[PDB]
């Protein structure tokens, strides 16, 4: 019923690794501070996204069991979840408590960041869907780990090995949901349901970036490998 000693160890351990990320305040601070041109915004995105991938790799490598996976599967897992993890982290930052009105400003800044209207709709649709879940810090971290250790990812040769690693994280997440939100016996399933919506950002991610309202679309060497651009 309650978390075992081992499950608390895993949770805290995963929480420690997740905290190594760039703090939410840092992101929202710069966005709210001053309106940037679509040019400056695109450059902010690439630098933010490059840092996020670097930290994501270090986070992934510390996930219990990931080191014993086939080297090519390791690559396949990171390459397949990098974009989803980035939008999930954006969702967390977007729905974080800010002073009155600020949330409207942040949303307005992003809406006019230079991103194509074509993609502004689904992105905010997902962001809002996430906010309605009243997720905790531990939930975001677990969900991100679950996203990374997805066995049903492409090019994965040994899916059973990945499954074994994802199971314990799901069990912990499930217990958390049944505790932090006893009133909603659908919270856990609803968290898992957002992951499918999260996957839709994969197919038209490159188009989303290339359609940025700027003249030049330059990315970092690391982003070129992880994303499908340039």
């Amino acid at each position: 019923m309650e978390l075992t000693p081992d499950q608390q160890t895993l949770l805290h351990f995963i929480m420690d690794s997740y905290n190594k990320q760039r703090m939410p305040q840092e992101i929202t601070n710069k966005i709210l501070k001053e309106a940037f041109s679509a040019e400056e915004n695109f450059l902010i995105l690439t630098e933010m996204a490059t840092n996020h991938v670097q930290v994501l790799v270090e986070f992934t490598k510390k996930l219990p069991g990931f080191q014993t996976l086939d080297h090519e599967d390791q690559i396949a897992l990171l390459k397949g979840s990098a974009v989803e993890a980035m939008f999930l982290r954006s969702a967390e930052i977007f729905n974080k408590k800010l002073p009155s009105g600020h949330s409207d400003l942040l949303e307005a800044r992003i809406r006019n960041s230079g991103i194509s209207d074509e993609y502004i709709t689904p992105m905010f649709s997902f962001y809002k869907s996430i906010g309605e879940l009243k997720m905790t810090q531990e939930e975001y971290a677990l969900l991100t780990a679950i996203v990374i250790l997805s066995p049903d990812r492409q090019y994965i040769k040994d899916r059973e090995a990945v499954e074994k690693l994802q199971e314990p994280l799901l069990d912990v997440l499930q217990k958390l949901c049944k505790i932090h939100q006893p009133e909603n016996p659908q919270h856990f399933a609803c968290l898992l349901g957002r992951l499918t919506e999260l996957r839709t950002f994969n197919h038209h991610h490159a188009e989303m970036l290339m359609s940025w309202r700027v003249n030049d679309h330059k990315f970092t060497p690391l982003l070129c490998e992880i994303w499908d651009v340039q």
Binding site: H71, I75, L222, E225
Partner: peptide, 12 residues
């Protein structure tokens, strides 16, 4: 070839 990713996954 994903050599940057491969590097980060090996010796940082």
């Amino acid at each position: 070839d994903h050599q940057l990713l491969r590097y980060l996954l090996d010796k940082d």
